[PDB]
Design a protein around this ligand. Structure first.
Ligand SMILES: Nc1ncnc2c1ncn2[C@@H]1O[C@H](COP(=O)(O)OP(=O)(O)O)[C@@H](O)[C@H]1O
Ligand SMILES: Nc1ncnc2c1ncn2[C@@H]1O[C@H](COP(=O)(O)OP(=O)(O)O)[C@@H](O)[C@H]1O
Ligand SMILES: C[C@@H]1NC(=O)N[C@@H]1CCCCCC(=O)O
Ligand SMILES: C[C@@H]1NC(=O)N[C@@H]1CCCCCC(=O)O
Ligand SMILES: [Mg+2]
Ligand SMILES: [Mg+2]
Ligand SMILES: [Mg+2]
Ligand SMILES: [Mg+2]
Lengths: 224, 224
């Protein structure tokens, strides 16, 4: 069954919005989908415990009805780096637990999308990063590029490090985080030439609730 | 004579403010200093032609009185990627010209700081990046890290790519781009452990005109 890890050029560039588009496209293609956000920070209190908004978006965009903990085993209240809040709360983040959760989702889904947290190298402990886990799992990687000044550099940096870890950069998604600007077409051309993976699609600037917008149509899953 | 290239985790993270601090510290140490911004975009019209604000800051923080063109040979009006505006204006950016300017500054300065543009991989043409030129010149690199969420990932990405190009990462500067936040000390500890170079100093949050503030005192040039 298909598995992809979605990373971004930084936090707040559209990993979640693009992940929802990817999931919607996969459902459209007829897959039994599941989104997985193993580690999340910046969460709200509910009667059932802490709930993170990215995990909720992935959960509602999955074709299967998934229990929250299955989508997101590790939930932290404070929106800081996972290693910091994990250490302060005395709740270690374990590779084995993250991997077990991925396997559990594969029990019922045949197309699984895993969203990272922050950018490529987000630390999970003082000696282990998110990049370490993706490398262990050998997940093909999808890069979400927020189309904005500074994204060529971040996209190139992330792509190079991914390739140097021996991993497959399966594709990239262009996310229009801001309204159209002057050098939009030139930026798209530059990113397209420089990123060594297929451009899967471009998600337009959608001001209101992009996470629930019908954005599956912007992704060409046959290029994946 | 000493030469350093200053790069940043992105544009707008403090390359210029930190570069001024570095230059001020070097003047304090007794060096005959010069700042060099070979390529600049986002400039204002004057009677003498276009003038870029980073180049002006480097010029005024140099111990020597330097002509503007010597500090910044390539000046573009629009603040977009150098390769885009160079191509649209029909003004090619040449490695040879950038290198000649560096040599010219070495005629009178014994300590030269070269500020890049954007982040590490800013394109200068469709086939040549700023990273290519730094690699040709074999300049030791100073990384400016804007202390903010997302900087651990960008700092790690930039450091890894620099080391993989065979270059020396001579040090890093922590720049407080925003007022103090909750995980400041933890971020400093994490960056310190992860960046494989000496922390040269930390520039505090200085709301008003940081470029002309006396910030040389925040840099320990003996760690360089
Ligand atoms: N294409 C879009 N159009 C408009 N707003 C966007 C779009 N993509 C992202 N958003 C908004 O920008 C912010 C960051 O997007 P998100 O997908 O949560 O980023 P990340 O998951 O990388 O943290 C959110 O408020 C989101 O609603
Ligand atoms: N430590 C500082 N305190 C407060 N403001 C900062 C500081 N460093 C940078 N600035 C401001 O942030 C913006 C970006 O800094 P600059 O040095 O020009 O970044 P870059 O050269 O990487 O583009 C500028 O407006 C600058 O005046
Ligand atoms: C040099 C430009 N003018 C400026 O002051 N910052 C811009 C940085 C542009 C980055 C171009 C590549 C990228 O998007 O990463
Ligand atoms: C996961 C966190 N919560 C969130 O929504 N974004 C934050 C990203 C944190 C980045 C930590 C490493 C760095 O600073 O690069
Ligand atoms: Mg987010
Ligand atoms: Mg997200
Ligand atoms: Mg700037
Ligand atoms: Mg600058």
């Amino acid at each position: 069954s298909k598995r992809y890890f979605v990373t971004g050029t930084d936090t707040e560039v559209g990993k979640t919005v693009a992940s929802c588009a990817l999931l919607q496209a996969a459902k459209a293609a007829g897959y039994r989908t599941a989104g997985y956000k193993p580690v999340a920070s910046g969460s709200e209190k509910t009667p059932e415990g802490l709930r993170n908004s990215d995990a909720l978006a992935l959960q509602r965009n999955s074709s299967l009805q998934l229990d929250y903990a299955t989508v997101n085993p590790y939930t932290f209240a404070e929106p800081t780096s996972p290693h910091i809040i994990s250490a302060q709360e005395g709740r270690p983040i374990e590779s084995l637990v993250m991997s077990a959760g991925l396997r559990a989702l594969e029990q019922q889904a045949d197309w699984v999308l895993v969203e990272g947290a922050g950018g490529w190298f987000t630390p999970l402990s003082d000696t282990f990063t998110f990049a370490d886990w993706v490398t262990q799992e050998q997940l093909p990687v999808i890069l979400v590029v927020g189309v904005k000044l500074g994204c060529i550099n971040h996209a190139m940096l992330t792509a190079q490090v991914i390739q140097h870890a021996g991993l497959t950069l399966a594709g990239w998604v262009a996310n229009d985080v801001t309204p159209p600007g002057k050098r939009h077409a030139e930026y798209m051309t530059t990113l397209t030439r420089m990123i060594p993976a297929p451009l899967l699609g471009e998600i337009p600037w959608l001001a209101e609730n992009p996470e629930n917008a019908a954005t599956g149509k912007y992704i060409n899953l046959a290029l994946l």
